[PDB]
Amino acid sequence: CQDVVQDVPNVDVQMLELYDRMSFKDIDGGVWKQGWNIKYDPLKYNAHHKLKVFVVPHSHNDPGWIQTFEEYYQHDTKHILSNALRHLHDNPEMKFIWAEISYFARFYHDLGENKKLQMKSIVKNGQLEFVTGGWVMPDEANSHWRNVLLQLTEGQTWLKQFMNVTPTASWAIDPFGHSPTMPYILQKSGFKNMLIQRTHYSVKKELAQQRQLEFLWRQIWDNKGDTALFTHMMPFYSYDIPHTCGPDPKVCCQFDFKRMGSFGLSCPWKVPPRTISDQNVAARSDLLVDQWKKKAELYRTNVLLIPLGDDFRFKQNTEWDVQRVNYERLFEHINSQAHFNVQAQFGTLQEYFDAVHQAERAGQAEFPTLSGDFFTYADRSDNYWSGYYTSRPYHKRMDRVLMHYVRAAEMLSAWHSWDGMARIEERLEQARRELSLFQHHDGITGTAKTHVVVDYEQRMQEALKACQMVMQQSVYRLLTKPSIYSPDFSFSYFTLDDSRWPGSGVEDSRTTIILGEDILPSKHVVMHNTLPHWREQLVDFYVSSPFVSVTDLANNPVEAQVSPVWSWHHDTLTKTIHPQGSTTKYRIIFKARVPPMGLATYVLTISDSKPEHTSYASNLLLRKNPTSLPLGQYPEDVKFGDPREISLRVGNGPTLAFSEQGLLKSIQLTQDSPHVPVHFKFLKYGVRSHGDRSGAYLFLPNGPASPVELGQPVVLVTKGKLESSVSVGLPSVVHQTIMRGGAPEIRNLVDIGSLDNTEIVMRLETHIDSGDIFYTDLNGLQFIKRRRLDKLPLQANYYPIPSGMFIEDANTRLTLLTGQPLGGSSLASGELEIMQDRRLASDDERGLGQGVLDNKPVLHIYRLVLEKVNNCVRPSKLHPAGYLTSAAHKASQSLLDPLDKFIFAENEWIGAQGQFGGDHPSAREDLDVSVMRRLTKSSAKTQRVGYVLHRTNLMQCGTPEEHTQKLDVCHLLPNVARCERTTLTFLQNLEHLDGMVAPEVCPMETAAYVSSHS
Ligand SMILES: OC[C@H](NC[C@H]1NC[C@H](O)[C@@H]1O)c1ccccc1
Ligand SMILES: *[C@@H]1O[C@H](CO)[C@@H](O)[C@H](O)[C@H]1NC(C)=O
């Protein structure tokens, strides 16, 4: 295994180093506004060295943005595809590339057989070529790598089945900045090349000057280079026709033949395209070939890529004709005039890359190596696209909840083969496809119109119900004596209980377990653990009595704690935000111990009085002028007091101190240690009253944030043996700090209400001497070092926080893990900050056509880990990566893949069993089974199950942590007959494994295996 910590890779371009050296000056470069006047030696190309030009027709089809997916399909995409089929069939030299498989599958299944066969023919002959082949062209900032793989697999599995092709070249022309997680996943999925477009205009200029726009993109920790993927970065401001033929859009726009008037389009540079004729073809060719030769100066080979397309292009038949005929006339002229020394033709993306690599093999070019990312993107001036790291945070959090539900449903149901009548494959395909659709670069990004966001939310709600159905049917089958099991596949044997989604204060949707002497004495509950190691974790349920005790299925008592159910209300009468306790339901909390990838059953039983193994939390309401808070049968009376500082400690864990406003002030790790200043604060950013306005995409603050005025907020302290908390009702945020014995959990119920032009940020202030350095993750896969640059504006120092961020000095580290992607930064030494929500009245001129005024309450979740790190083996100062400790990684897993909870719905569960998976191997803490998916339906004689295994890299800090079992996924199901290593999409077999044993992977590596069973 490669060492991902101690060996600094030697690369030609390292993006953090490049950023430190770059000046980022925004000067007028002439017709190429953000470049320079390109010059070329006309004698560079001659009869023996011609410029080979591939014009690649394309149509960017957003799966929802200004219209829903189905609205665009009906108005535009179905016509684009039907006309592409007709025009390509009739014009054999014409070509077209297609990226979004969600639309292609929607179209193809509506075709008659005659057309399906014609379509397969133009794909097989190479005229219509799929690029990337994912369900969507995903966002690369907020998306989790597991969902990027899910959607790539959904589209490519569909393509292999119906079109018999698997793309090896990727096309990503629109995500707003680019992540190295993409080449990581693509290179492990058979890809050989990729293309990107939205990178900072200053980066395009810098790399263009050094002819470093094509590079071998490797991961930041990859010393050897085995993760490298050839990457082409386009050079100009847009992927539209005016910015793809060459440096001068006033000239290129004249070669977009859809802009002459009848289509309702024009050229903003005021010179319209003109129909090519025999009397103007020589002059038109001389203008066009000159743009091509200028663009070719920015690259190292004599093979030039010229994309020809834009949003929802190639719809009407007249448009296919106007572009095709005019370009055919230009090609016939240019290719016949030796003096140009050009051979131009329509081509596909793969054809371009194959020709570039033929040039490379002929020794005509060597390509530079590069590592790093391409965030934060700016397309012009100070317009940095860091707003979409937070926009529509409700749905960003929903994405992570559905991510987990899809994994758990696919894993729980994979253990068995299911009859078709159970509709298991049907519900899983629906869930995978709705979650995959939301990875679109206007879905999770929060950049679609309000009714489109509603469509995505409705689709995800249906996917969550599909997952619950599959999960609960699986649990009933796995835990019921086989000869008693009698399923009704439409019945709800269990309901899922989720404590953090939508969340307390967001939706009252959790069911109360109703017990009573005259109705039902007890209730079985089951926990599932999708991670491949034993896990203990506190779980909670709502119950109708405080006198409840817990037992495991061997009837062993389990210690429990009961607390009230508190809800916060904005009292319009008193103009205060305060808590009300339920007088009819209570929370019971206890530790569940669940096997690796397994299930554990517990029983909740009511009694007439306080049971022996259940304790009751105390509750203290701090506010002046308190009023009574009755709690029904709860046995401890609520206590009251004036606001005051307080300290809490659960178990042997840390001791946390809080201000009189209910916000953390310090953390003391152990009895002896110091009380380390760690202060939470809420602040607000505004919008500029002159100049450019923030919107769904852009973050353009009107200076540093200002503190939210807190008033004298009401603070609620609940102190229990197993779980304690401090909750405070602040303006727009009910902030909670929860302690269960280790790193605290923070929950924010964020309701920005009607505060227009406001962004609410949560900041942590510490005295960690971090300087200008901080770390943020990329797609939940890796942590990259960031350096705050005062030469760039505040919004440029904001980065995606898809799952965590940290700051550290020689001795101390503070890590903040998240349960949802949000934007954040470290704007001063010792600080961390993460945006909670933003409400913006204005459109930001990127096409959305509205502000962001559809905010809704969202429950954001986090874990806060303060640790000593002076004994940890960390990368050297020049290494561009950082790595989590064991505790921070486990805290992240606690947020993203919690135990699932099931409440048996009926009164008695006949044949109930107490555990499943007790014999599953408990793997090393850094290894995860990211995906377990049965790949065959019940009629297959040889069943196949796919596994994706991911091993992260945790810092060595002197904590032995030993005795773990080897995990061989190929023997998890019985009767294995074959074990193969495959690409991550499971579509290609790479290695037949000896002994049918799937070896574990190296740190920072991800591998896929398929086991076959007889
Ligand atoms: O190339 C045309 C450009 N496309 C914008 C892309 N980014 C946001 C969406 O995903 C859209 O595809 C545009 C289209 C419409 C209005 C403004 C700009
Ligand atoms: C699928 O593509 C392969 C290319 O290697 C070809 O050999 C195979 O026959 C194709 N299957 C069909 C006919 O769909």
Ligand SMILES: [Zn+2]
């Ligand atoms: Zn787009």
